[PDB]
Amino acid sequence: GSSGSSGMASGQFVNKLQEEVICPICLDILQKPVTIDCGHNFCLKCITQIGETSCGFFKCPLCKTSVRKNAIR
């Protein structure tokens, strides 16, 4: 029996303007913005996670609008 490891770094920070829409739920770069009937845009990681017990229809969190997943079958 024997082993060992060691490592250290610093890296560099970048100063740029990120004009990429963000999810108002998780607050993460919205990679896949889904504009539901209500309009608001959410991230798959969210819209999906939120749907645990429900079948598919879920009243938008931001606005209480009767929305029901519907699209070209």
Residues that bind Zn ion in the complex, under the rule CB under 5 A: 23, 25-26, 38, 40, 43, 46, 60, 62-63
Name beta bridge partners: 35. 41
Nearer to Zn ion, 46 or 69 (CB): 46
Minimum CB–partner distance for residue 53 and Zn ion (Å): 19
Nearer to Zn ion, 10 or 42 (CB): 42
CA distances from 57 to 22, 33, 73 (A): 23, 17, 15
Would you put residue 46 in left (φ > 0), alpha (ψ -120 to 50) or beta?
Answer: alpha
Minimum CB–partner distance for residue 1 and Zn ion (Å): 45
